[PDB]
Amino acid sequence: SVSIPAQISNLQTKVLQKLVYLEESITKQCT
């Protein structure tokens, strides 16, 4: 009820922001 939900939500946060950096990196590097 508490611990596992926390572990998964932390995973979601970390992955999504890494994907954000890639999106910006592509735009900046490939222009």
């Binding site: 611990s3 926390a6 572990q7 998964i8 932390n10 995973l11």
Partner: protein, 51 residues
């Protein structure tokens, strides 16, 4: 419980498991009665926290 005191901890880490022991004394914490001695066996794991 306010009349219970936890003292004389003993802690050791192996390869993945840890041993933990604590004494419960009555009130005094030093010379009081021993109500129980408790031993815990478990593992050190990664639960998505900082440590």
């Amino acid at each position: 419980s306010a009349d219970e005191c936890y003292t004389n901890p003993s802690f050791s880490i192996g390869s993945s498991i840890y041993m933990f022991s604590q004494e419960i004394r009555k009130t005094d914490c030093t010379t009081g009665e021993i109500l129980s001695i408790q031993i815990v066996l478990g593992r050190i794991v990664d639960k998505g926290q900082q440590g």
